[PDB]
């Protein structure tokens, strides 16, 4: 379960994050955790959670995995 | 009168008198010696 | 069903018997105490575990003990 959890973190960062854009300017770009598909949303929520730089609504990660992965060599 | 002084010897009455004495002693000290922080 | 045990410190005061709201305990002939009476628990299948018996016992420590075991419909006191 621990290794499946870590593989899921890696997969959702690789597919839905902005990791290849984060590493160029890591001071001014917010790390993206995973995309939001919530059909209960309205259009102001879809507009407001589309922060940048994303296509749709995303969550901004606080778990710190981009700094750890960028330090240990992920690019 | 013996029973009245026995009642005055009970625990809440003596606690009231003694805390009135202690609080009044502290109040008079903080009046005549205003705001002591040191010494 | 709960576990009710009687220990040899019983002095046959009958207090536990007259405290049970379910008629589980009874007094048997015995020779271990001056009262020649000892408690016994032949009907522990109807015991709910309220512990009134333990409250009624005068001895230190208790001579009747209720160990809450597996629950049934009778031990849960269910009328349904």
């Amino acid at each position: 379960i621990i290794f499946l959890w870590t593989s899921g973190n890696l997969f959702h960062v690789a597919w839905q994050g902005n990791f290849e854009q984060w590493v160029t300017d890591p001071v001014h770009i917010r790390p993206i955790a995973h995309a939001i598909w919530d059909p209960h949303f309205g259009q102001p929520a879809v507009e407001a959670f589309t922060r940048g730089g994303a296509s749709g609504p995303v969550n901004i990660s606080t778990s710190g995995v981009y700094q750890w992965w960028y330090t240990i060599g992920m690019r | 009168m013996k029973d009245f002084t026995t009642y005055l010897s009970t625990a809440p009455v003596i606690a009231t008198i003694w805390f009135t004495f202690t609080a009044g002693l502290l109040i008079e000290i903080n009046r005549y010696f205003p705001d002591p922080l040191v010494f | 069903a709960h576990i009710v045990k009687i220990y040899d410190t019983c002095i046959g005061c009958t207090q536990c018997v007259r405290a049970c709201p379910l008629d589980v305990l009874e007094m048997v002939p015995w020779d271990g105490c001056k009262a020649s009476q000892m408690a016994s628990a032949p009907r522990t299948e109807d015991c709910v575990g309220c512990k009134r018996c333990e409250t009624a016992c005068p001895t230190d420590f208790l001579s009747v003990r209720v160990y809450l075991g597996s629950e049934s419909t009778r031990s849960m006191g269910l009328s349904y």
Binding site: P44, A45, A48, F49, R51, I60, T62 | - | T73, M76, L78, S79, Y80
Partner: protein
């Protein structure tokens, strides 16, 4: 939960006053508990509770909803911690009567007999709701304040 709440209030407020620049604010206000309640809890929860409002919403609305969500789970755990079993068992016995006497619904009948939660189970469920609401409330406040003001 109390002790880790103290160490994280302390950590978070000393680092917020470091990150803003005015460590003098922490040095002046941390020596008395009204300074805590005014300058860390009241002050740093302005943009949190403005996550949604009758004028609109922004990206902090999820942390405002989670903040209220944690207050609610905390409060619901107080019910299991304060009120105890026999009240609820008498209430469930009246509910059992009410279901078995109502026509056209008593054709449906339970397989497991409904009873109240046990005493140990009550303590575990109350402590569980208590702790989950504690964690969600402080995580919502911490993430929303630190991300909204920086």
């Amino acid at each position: 939960l109390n002790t880790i709440g103290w160490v994280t209030f302390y950590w978070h407020w000393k680092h917020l006053t470091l990150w803003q620049g005015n460590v003098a604010q922490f040095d002046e206000s941390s020596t008395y508990l009204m300074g805590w309640l005014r300058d860390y809890l009241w002050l740093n929860s302005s943009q949190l509770i403005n996550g949604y409002n009758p004028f609109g919403m922004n990206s902090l609305s999820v942390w405002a909803w989670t903040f209220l969500f944690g207050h609610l789970i905390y409060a619901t755990g107080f019910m299991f911690l304060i009120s105890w079993r026999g009240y609820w068992q008498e209430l469930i016995e009246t509910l059992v009567w009410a279901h078995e006497k109502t026509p056209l619904a008593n054709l449906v009948y339970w397989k497991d007999k409904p009873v109240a939660l046990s005493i140990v189970q009550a303590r575990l469920v109350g402590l569980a709701h208590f702790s989950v609401g504690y964690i969600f409330t402080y995580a919502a406040f911490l993430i929303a304040s630190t991300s909204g003001r920086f």
